[PDB]
Design a protein around this ligand. Sequence first.
Ligand SMILES: *SCCNC(=O)CCNC(=O)[C@H](O)C(C)(C)COP(=O)(O)OP(=O)(O)OC[C@H]1O[C@@H](n2cnc3c(N)ncnc32)[C@H](O)[C@@H]1OP(=O)(O)O
Ligand code: F3S
Length: 81
Amino acid sequence: PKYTIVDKETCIACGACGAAAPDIYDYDEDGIAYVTLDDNQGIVEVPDILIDDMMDAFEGCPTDSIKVADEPFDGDPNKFE
Ligand SMILES: *SCCNC(=O)CCNC(=O)[C@H](O)C(C)(C)COP(=O)(O)OP(=O)(O)OC[C@H]1O[C@@H](n2cnc3c(N)ncnc32)[C@H](O)[C@@H]1OP(=O)(O)O
Ligand code: F3S
């Protein structure tokens, strides 16, 4: 399975992610992206139908704040860094 999460400390509101995968990434009140599947905790498996969009957002983010992994992040966007 794939999991995704936004590192809110490195996100600078580039806005590429919400457009590429609106069913995965949205913006909080401060304009910072987060994953709507699981309240940005990187624990819900990304639906198969949304993998391509996820990849588009992952590749498009200028700050590499979107992370993609094969195991849950359990809330830590830098777990695999
Ligand atoms: S990043 C936010 C803080 N930065 C700024 O405000 C920077 C001013 N913008 C820039 O200098 C350029 O936008 C970036 C991309 C930061 C540096 O350019 P890149 O050469 O790395 O190039 P890309 O052009 O491929 O970025 C493409 C995409 O970025 C998304 N995008 C660009 N500009 C915007 C705005 N204004 N709003 C939303 N998205 C924007 C698009 O998703 C686009 O990429 P896709 O790969 O097609 O999804
Ligand atoms: S900088 Fe933030 S707004 Fe989305 S494209 Fe990258 S996570």
